[PDB]
């Protein structure tokens, strides 16, 4: 964990001094970047992903476990998923709305969004932003001649930026292990796709030969954009994940719970302790559950001079016990801190304010709102690049007039806070709102036929004339 | 193993955290490359040949490391060492192809080409001897492409001036002689007063397999014996090793294309 | 820590007695300032940044840790991030608005802001203000002939000021390490940019030679401003960060919690203690988990004169324990003090009233508002310089009339408090407000088509005429 | 270990740069009634 998440070589930004041409003529440089990514950045991302899947350290670190006769009782709590799903839903659970002053651009955007199911795509990006801290999307002109948008996995994609303060993206790379499922032999073959501002170059490598890039079939392929098609989004200016900073506390909670599970499994709850010199028949001991009287008769010792004295018999129940106060106060502190440092509502120490939920939520999530507003800023910074790409491909296909401009689009964000349609209708119709009958009926589910009802009303209103 | 004094190995090639005298390299500061990495000269001069299969030969080395060394003394060792292996291979290939040294497996080399054609000049470095060295090539319609030299003789090259133009024939800043680039060999086999030249486009090489690196933790190293003489088991002794292999192939298309200058 | 954060040479302001020419002729003086910055100021900024990244001292101080058989259980709590994100979101989570009496200037400002995405930029400055206590911004006329604004990293930028009481900025410097990813060689070269009121000088240096500034390719590069382009913002009069003064409490909390985690890992929760001279078969002891009766039979000792006497057997459970009261009171005090000295809401000791989540918030954040109101002043003091630069470049490019003046702009700040659109609509339409139908519909998300609804209402309103 | 080098040392796959394939299978057989089988043989 620590040695991967907090290493200095992980989470860096790759930069290159030369131009795209200076890089592309010397493809070995890209191999150096790929190797550095595999050796430093990928481990971090794999660890974060494992936590999202709940494969926490406690499950895999079997090295020091005991199972000679006791149970293993190793445990994983899934806080990482709880946190990331909550934070992502709060940010993008409600679709981003688009406004523009020019309807031609607005409808071109809306057409592209509908074709690509952009709502779900945006949510999946927000989720990757939550777990890995960064996310990538690739835009491609499809074989069926349509502009498509696809997410690119963080563990297999990265971008090399211009060294200047402007940090334009010079080139992006994607690489994937190609294998049969039979896992016969060498898993270590990678396909590499290198994206430049004018096309895709395709190569093969394996980790074995030190990743020297070999041209694939169809080794080059032109694309009609005029800038590198991959886009990168950041969770924050450090590109750090949401639970990445509390993984050590999640570990401590795993350990403490597995400790108590061991204590429960391995010690006897209670026993009848019998002391003193005596005869116990193991056949008679089976009556222990059904006897009412326990009679202990002490051994009488006879002295050689004739004295007599008795042994000390004794009997009573004993039971195991542990420091409940201190262990529960400690485990509660860990849980409380995991929620505090992630601005997630601590369900165990929570009270519903009165009867109305929205404003109580806006209070309790105030700390989460502060981070989300920055995430929102970086997200819009990325969406503008997606729009720049879309307008460029539309113009190059002349699917829109070259006169249009896409940077005027206004991205409007809404949080996924709970809402109350009754209070909102009352607030909209008071203060002068208007609603068409069919729409108003469509809002209430007690109408079995929201349209037939209109005819059924016309009949009544007609016979009311007579 | 159960030995509590550090393990003596034969040969003593295993990296260790604890020296034979018991000194422990804890908190050990990372070394620095006080010399620049060397590069293959025949890969710099010669002509590359697209190849599969064929005549090649395999270079290889295995670097064993104690996992205490790998944990406490120097964690990044293997990553810092891959350049240094690649250098060792480059030097081995250069020394085999150029000087016919180091038990070269090929039956071909520049030293053998020169010794066969007897295209050798006895003499000190002079403008006339440099011109004669070049003329041994142009006699056979071949023009010199570069020079190979021991860097320690620039002191001799600076002392030669063209008596017509009255200027240095050797540009010490460009490191070019008579307008031709001079490449330097660090190997100990090329002596101070010796200089080699040829049309290196006539020297051809190929690389069927680029350097392959595998790191392993469970092999046996039969080539390294414990003090008791039993072979080292990586897993059992808690030790790690890196294997590097490479294939190289060498061909000389015209063995008269090379000439040599040597002290009288 | 202490020796770096509270040292006297860190956090000083560099001044120079001479004019810009007196400095520029003697560039070695810039070497002295760069050297001082590297040896005193940068360490402090590195520590503050490590704390924002959660790499607290407790994670890296492995020097005295133990792992011969116990676990490491080192821990980091991320208070620095929690604090900084909260305070910055509160100050700049809501974009700064602009007012002016002249629409020509107002639209030139707004055009520049839109091009540079100034909203996100301002937030990233307010964050650097919160981490390091100071932040920088560089303005440049781009190659494409556009006015661009880029934040400059606090760890690699500083300014040398005029010695006089007015403290005009004489020169700004930026210096960055240049390397490929594969080299870690001796000559750690730093590229240096020196910004003066007329241009940029560029140099190379390395620490090995003593930071002798050597001129470079294109050693000078003119710019069209008339004052040094870099601007510095200060978090407060002292340029101190927000958690700089509580890092020692964060450390104490890390140590206390890792101490409890050691106690939990290393001691057995409970054990069955058996005393006295006895025969225990370790094969029989495995029944301990499932036996109901424990029978202890004491050894009988026989005296040479024939006496008989019994050994003292005993048995019972024992369990580990720690001072939960005192350790929890201490750790609660640390948490309370960390929040108190940073005016951040203490979530563990908090209660909320009703549903006006803005008003109890203004009560509880009153202490935080007092500091923010000062930071707002210094931030505007910086924004005015940004505007002075922008007007100068616009006039020198004649993109605006030389008659205009930018100091009339009024910067309006709003806090990121929660808001209640229903309460506000009721307060705005009461008291005589007016809203257009399409806008009013755009406020409520139950309208699936806010514009189609108007046509759909016209149809109803038409058939109502018959 | 079953294959030896020319010098008699056991073949080490790593140190020699070799690869080897192992195939294994578990199979069980049972005659439920020894009388259920008969054979015709040439005299």
Does C142 contact B at CB distance below 8 Å?
no
Tell me the CA end-to-end span of chain D in Å, nearest whole number.
48
Cβ contact A54:A212 at 8 Å = no
Compute the distance between CA of residue C54 and CA of residue C390 in angstroms, rounded to an integer: 38
Determine which helix (DSSP H) or strand (DSSP E) holds C444, and give its type and residue range: none
Question: Phi and psi at residue C410, in whole multiples of 5°?
Answer: -105, 125
To test the contact with chain C by mutation, choose from B26, B27, B33, B84 the residue with the greatest count of C C-beta atoms within 10 A, namely B33
DSSP element (H, E) containing B59: strand B56-66
Residue C246 C-alpha, separation from nearest chain A C-alpha, in angstroms: 16
Name the DSSP class of C244.
G
CA distance C265 to C270: 13
Q: How many CA atoms lie within 13 A of C209 on its CB side?
A: 13
Rounded-to-integer distance, Cα A240 and Cα A260, Å:
33
Kindly give, in sequence order, each residue whose CB lies less than 8 Å from that of residue B26, ignoring residues fewer than 6 positions away: B17, B72, B73
Of the candidates A17, A165, A433, the beta carbon closest to that of C440 is on: A433
Strand order in the sheet with C15-16: C15-16, C157-162, C169-177, C189-195, C199-206, C214-222
- Rounded Cα–Cα distance for residues A49 and C120 (Å): 29
Mutating which of D5, D10, D11, D15 best tests the B interface, going by the most B Cβ atoms within 10 A? D15
CA distance A122 to A113: 10
Place of tokens 């659970």: A93
DSSP B28: P
Q: Which is it for strands C308-310 and C300-302: parallel, antiparallel or unpaired? A: antiparallel
Tokens of A381: 């910074």
**Chains contacting D (3+ CB pairs below 8 angstroms):** B
Q: Which residues of C touch B31 (CB under 8 A)?
A: none
* Strand order, beta sheet including B120-122: B120-122, B258-262, B195-198, B146-150, B180-185, B176-177, B170-171
Q: What is the chain D residue with the closest CA to B221?
A: D15
Cα–Cα distance measured from residue B251 to residue C5, given in angstroms and rounded to the nearest whole number: 65
Residue A252's nearest CA partner among C321, C325, C348, C265 is C265
A423 to chain C: closest CA residue: C422
**What is the rounded distance in angstroms from the CA atom of residue C84 to the CA atom of residue C242?**
7
**Which pairing describes strands A270-275 and C293-296: parallel, antiparallel, or unpaired?**
parallel
For residue C184, the chain B residues in CB contact (below 8 A) are 30, 32-33, 80
Half-sphere CA count of B205, side-chain side, radius 13 A = 25
The distance from CA C260 to its chain's CA centroid, rounded to whole angstroms, is 28
Q: Decide: B114 and B120 in contact? Cβ < 8 Å.
A: yes
Q: How far apart are alpha carbons B8 and B17 in whole angstroms?
A: 13
**Under a CB-based contact definition with an 8 Å cutoff, are residues C293 and A272 in contact?**
yes
Pair of tokens at residue C238:
């002292």
Q: Does B219 contact D17 at a Cβ distance shorter than 8 Å?
A: no
Residue C417, strand partner residues: none
Map tokens 């000190």 to a residue.
B124
Gyration radius (Cα) of chain A, Å? 34
Interface test with A, best of C347, C421, C442 (most A CBs within 10 A): C347
CB nearest A39 (choices: B79, B210, B212) = B79
Q: A243 Cβ partners below 8 Å, 6+ apart? A: A51, A79, A80, A83, A84, A131, A250, A342
Q: Which residue from A16, A14, A32, A24 is spatially nearest to A211, judged by alpha carbons?
A: A32
| C-alpha triplet C136, C139, C142: angle, nearest 5° | 145
B72: exposed, middle or buried (Cβ count in 10 Å: 0-12, 13-18, 19+):
middle
Contact C87, C118 (CB under 8 A): no
CA–CA dist A366, C365 (Å, integer): 12
Other beta carbons less than 10 A from residue B16's beta carbon? 18
How far is C-alpha A207 from the chain's CA centre? 29
Pairing mode, strands B220-226 and B9-10: antiparallel
Parallel, antiparallel, or unpaired for β B170-171 and B176-177? antiparallel
Nearest to A27, CA basis, from A222, A213, A228, A229: A213
What length does chain D have? Answer: 43
Task: For chain A, positions 447-466, list CB contacts with chain B under 8 A.
Answer: none
Of residues C114, C290, C456, nearest to A436 (C-beta) = C456
Beta bridge partners of C193: C174, C202
Tokens of B112: 């053998």
| Percentages (nearest 5) of helix, strand, coil residues in chain C | 45, 20, 40
**Which tokens hold the place of C53?**
């990244």
User: Rg of chain B's alpha carbons, rounded to an integer?
Assistant: 23
The SS3 assignment for C392 reads helix
Closest residue in A to C433 (Cα–Cα): A431
Cross-sheet strand order for the sheet of B9-10 = B9-10, B220-226, B231-233
Cβ–Cβ gap A210/B209 under 8 Å: no
Give the pair of three-digit tokens for residue A51: 């936590």
Contact by Cβ (8 Å): B110, B196? yes
Distance CA C77, CA C339 (A): 13
Please report how the helices A103-116 and A366-396 are oriented relative to each other, as an axis angle in degrees rounded to 10. Answer: 100
Region label for C232, one of left (φ > 0), alpha (ψ between -120 and 50) or beta (otherwise): beta
DSSP, collapsed to helix, strand or coil, labels residue B183 as strand
DSSP string, C38-96: IIIIHHHHHHHHHHHTT--HHHH-GGG---SSS--------HHHHHHHHHHHHHHSSPP
Chains B and D lie in contact, requiring 3 or more CB pairs less than 8 Å apart: yes
CA separation for the pair A297, D40 (Å, rounded):
83
Q: What is the number of residues in chain B?
A: 264
Which residues of B fall within a CB distance of 8 Å from A210? 82, 210-213
Helix axes C366-396, C103-116, angle to 10 degrees: 100
Question: Across the interface, which of C142, C269, C457 has its CB nearest the CB of A263?
Answer: C269
Place of tokens 């720049």: A388
Does residue B11 have a cis bond before it (omega within 30 degrees)? yes
Tokens of C307: 């006496």
B246 touches D at CB < 8 Å = no
Chain B, nearest residue to A210 by Cα: B212
Q: Is there an interface between C and A (3+ Cβ pairs < 8 A)? A: yes
Query: What do you get for the CA distance between the two ends of chain C, in Å?
Result: 83
HEC assignment per residue over chain A: CHHHHCCCCCCCCCEECCCHHHHHCCCHHHHHHHHHHHHHHHHHHHHHHHHHCCCCHHHHCHHHCCCCCCCCCCCCCCHHHHHHHHHHHHHHCCCCEEECCCHHHHHHHHHHHHHHCHHHHHHHHHHHHHHCCEEEEEEEECCCCCEEEEEECHHHEEEEEECCCCCCEEEEEEEEECCCCCCCCCCCEEEEEEECCCEEEEEEEECCCCCCCEEEEEEEEECCCCCCCCEEEECCCCCCCCCHHHHHHHHHHHHHHHHHHHHHHHCCCEEEEEECCCCCCCCCHHHHHCCCCCCCCCCEEECCCCCEEECCCEEEEEECCCCHHHHHHHHHHHHHHHHHCCCCCCHHHCCCCCCCHHHHHHHHCHHHHHHHHHHHHHHHHHHHHHHHHHHHHHHHCCCCCCCCCCCCCEEECCCCCCCCHHHHHHHHHCCCCCCCHHHHHHHCCCCCCCCHHHHHHHHHHHHCCC
Using the Cβ of B223 and the Cβ atoms of chain D, whether some distance falls under 8 Å is answered with yes
With H, G, I as helix, E, B as strand and everything else as coil, classify residue C106.
helix
Q: Which chains touch C (3 or more CB pairs under 8 A)?
A: A, B
d(CA B16, CA B161): 54
* CB neighbourhood size of B19 (10 A): 10
Looking at the complex, does the CB of residue D34 fall below 8 Å from at least one CB of chain B?
A: no
Strand duo A308-310 + A231-234: pairing: unpaired
Angle ∠(A376,A378,A380) on CA atoms, nearest 5: 70
Residue C389 is given by DSSP the state: H
Residues of D in Cβ contact (< 8 Å) with B220: 12, 14-15
Contact assignment for A245 to C307 by CB distance below 8 Å: no
Residues in a beta bridge with C160: C171
CA torsion angle A375 A378 A384 A387 (round to 10): -50
The total number of residues shown for chain A amounts to 466
Selection from B216, A326, B109, C355 nearest residue D18 by Cα: B216
Q: Does B58 touch chain A (CB under 8 A)?
A: no
| Secondary structure (3-state) at C434 | coil
Helical H segments across chain B, by residue range: 41-45, 67-68, 77-99, 110-117, 127-138, 154-157
For A274, counting Cβ atoms within 10 Å of its Cβ (0-12 exposed, 13-18 middle, 19+ buried), the class is buried
List the structure tokens of C256: 């206390």
Q: Considering only CA atoms, which of C266, C273, C326, C252 is closest in space to residue A326?
A: C326
For the record, the structure tokens of B79 come out as 């990553």
Q: Work out whether strand A15-16 and strand B146-150 pair parallel, antiparallel, or are unpaired.
A: unpaired
DSSP strand pairing (B258-262 vs B195-198): antiparallel
Cβ neighbors of C377 (< 8 A, separation 6 or more) are: none
Task: Please state, in angstroms and rounded to a whole number, the distance separating the CA atoms of residues C73 and C255.
Answer: 10
- A309, A300 in Cβ contact below 8 A? yes
How do B47-48 and B203-206 pair as beta strands?
Answer: parallel
Token pair belonging to A427:
């607030």
CA distances to A435, A448, A449, A460, C420 from A455, rounded to whole Å, are 18, 14, 10, 9, 39
Q: Cβ–Cβ of B34/C186 closer than 8 Å?
A: yes
| Burial grade of B195 (CB within 10 A; 0-12, 13-18, 19 or more) | buried
Asked if the C-beta of A32 comes within 8 angstroms of chain B's C-beta atoms, the answer is no
Residue of A nearest to B243 (CA): A208
Q: Which residues of C touch B83 (CB under 8 A)?
A: 182
Q: CA-based Rg of chain C, rounded to a whole angstrom?
A: 34
- Give the residues across from A224 on adjacent strands: none
With a CB-CB cutoff of 8 Å, which residues 164-203 of chain C face chain B?
Answer: 182, 184-186
* CA end-to-end span of chain B: 59
Which residue do the tokens 């303060």 mark?
A: A165
Pairwise CA distance, residues B256 & B119, whole Å:
8
Here the tokens at position A451 are 């349209």
- Say whether residue A212 is in contact with chain B using an 8 A CB cutoff: yes
Helix or strand or coil: residue B194? coil
CB contact under 8 A, D12 and B222: yes
Please tell me the distance from the alpha carbon of residue C292 to that of residue A270, in angstroms, as a whole number.
7
> What are the tokens at A233?
């989004």
Q: Helical H runs in C287-420?
A: 324-340, 359-364, 366-396
In the numeric block, the tokens 């057997």 are attached to C313
Provide CB contacts within 8 A for A49, sequence distance 6+: A131, A132, A155
Q: How far apart are CA A13 and CA A161, in angstroms?
A: 8
DSSP for C272-302, please give it.
EEEESS----TTTGGGGGT-SEEEE-PPEEE
Q: Could you write out the DSSP letters of every residue in C148-169?
A: EEEEE-GGGEEEEEESSTT--E
Chain B residue with the nearest C-alpha to that of C63 = B27
Selecting from A238, A303, A431 the residue whose C-beta is nearest the C-beta of C425 gives A431
- Give the method used: cryo-EM
| Location of structure tokens 């709940």 | A54
């Amino acid at each position: 964990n620590i040695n991967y998440l907090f290493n200095d070589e992980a989470n860096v930004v790759y930069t290159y001094d030369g131009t795209e041409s200076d890089l592309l003529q010397n493809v070995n440089e890209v191999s150096k970047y790929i190797e550095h990514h595999m050796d430093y950045q990928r481990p971090r991302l794999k660890v974060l992903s494992d936590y999202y899947e709940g494969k926490t350290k406690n499950l895999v670190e079997l090295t020091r476990r005991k199972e000679e006769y006791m149970a293993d009782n190793r445990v994983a709590h899934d806080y990482a998923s709880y946190i990331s799903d909550f934070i992502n839903g709060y940010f993008l659970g409600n679709p981003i709305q688009y406004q523009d002053d020019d309807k031609d651009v607005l409808e071109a955007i809306e057409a592209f969004n509908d074709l690509n199911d952009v709502e779900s795509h945006n949510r999946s990006l927000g989720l990757d932003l939550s777990i890995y801290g960064k996310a990538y999307e690739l835009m491609i002109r499809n074989q069926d001649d349509e502009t498509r948008l696809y997410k690119s996995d963080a563990m297999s994609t990265f971008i090399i930026y211009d060294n200047t303060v402007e940090r334009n993206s010079i080139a992006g790379v994607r690489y994937l292990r190609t294998k049969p499922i039979d896992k016969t032999d060498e898993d270590e073959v990678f396909t590499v796709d290198l994206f430049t501002s004018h096309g895709v170059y395709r190569y093969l490598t394996n980790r074995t030969n030190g990743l020297k890039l070999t041209p694939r079939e169809n080794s080059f392929e032109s694309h009609s954009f005029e800038r590198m098609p991959i886009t990168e989004f950041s969770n924050n200016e450090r590109r750090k994940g949401d639970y990445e900073k509390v993984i050590t506390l999640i570990d401590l909670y795993d350990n403490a719970e597995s400790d108590t599970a061991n204590y429960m499994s391995d010690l006897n709850d209670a026993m009848l302790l019998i002391k003193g010199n005596l005869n116990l028949d193991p056949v008679e001991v089976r009556k222990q559950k059904e006897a009412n009287v326990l009679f202990l008769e002490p051994t009488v010792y006879v002295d050689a001079e004739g004295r007599e004295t008795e042994g000390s018999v004794d009997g009573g129940y004993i039971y195991k016990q542990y420091d409940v106060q201190g262990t529960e106060a400690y485990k509660d502190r860990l849980n409380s801190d995991i929620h505090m440092f992630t601005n997630t509502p601590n369900m165990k120490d929570d009270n519903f304010s009165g009867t109305q939920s929205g404003e109580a939520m806006k209070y309790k999530l105030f700390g989460l709102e502060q981070r989300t507003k920055t995430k929102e800023g970086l997200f819009t910074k990325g969406l503008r690049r997606r729009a720049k790409l879309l307008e460029t491909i539309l113009k190059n296909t002349r699917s829109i007039d070259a006169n249009k401009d896409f940077n005027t689009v206004r991205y409007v964000y809404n949080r996924n806070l709970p809402k109350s349609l009754i209070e909102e209708l009352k607030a909209y119709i008071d203060s002068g709102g208007k609603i068409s009958q069919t729409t108003l009926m469509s809002l209430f589910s007690f109408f079995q036929d929201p349209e037939l009802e209109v005819k059924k009303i016309e009949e009544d209103e007609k016979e009311s004339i007579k | 193993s159960n030995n509590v004094k550090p393990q003596v190995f034969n040969p003593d090639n295993v990296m260790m955290h604890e020296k034979k005298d018991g000194t422990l390299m804890n908190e050990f500061t990372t070394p620095i490359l006080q010399e620049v990495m060397e590069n293959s000269k025949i890969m710099q001069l010669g002509k590359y040949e697209p190849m599969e299969g064929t005549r090649a030969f395999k270079l290889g080395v295995i670097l064993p490391v104690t996992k205490e060394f790998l944990n406490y003394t120097y964690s990044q060792f293997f990553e810092e060492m891959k350049p240094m292996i690649a250098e060792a291979f480059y030097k081995k290939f250069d020394e085999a192809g150029i000087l016919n040294q180091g038990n070269n497996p090929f039956g071909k080399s520049i030293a053998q080409s020169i010794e066969k054609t007897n295209k050798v000049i006895k003499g000190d470095f002079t403008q006339d001897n440099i011109i004669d060295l070049e003329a041994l090539l142009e006699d056979d319609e071949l023009e010199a492409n570069a020079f190979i030299s021991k860097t320690q003789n620039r002191s001799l090259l600076r002392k030669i001036v063209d008596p017509e133009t009255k200027e240095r024939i050797y540009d010490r800043n460009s490191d070019s002689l008579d307008g031709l680039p001079v490449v330097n060999l660090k190997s100990s086999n090329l002596k101070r007063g010796e200089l080699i030249t040829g049309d290196f486009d006539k020297l051809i090489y190929g690389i069927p397999q680029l350097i392959e690196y595998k790191i392993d933790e469970t092999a046996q190293l039969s080539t390294v014996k414990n003090e008791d003489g039993t072979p080292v088991n990586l897993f059992e002794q808690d030790m790690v090793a890196l294997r590097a292999t490479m294939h190289v192939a060498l061909h000389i298309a015209d063995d008269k294309a090379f000439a040599k200058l040597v002290p009288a």
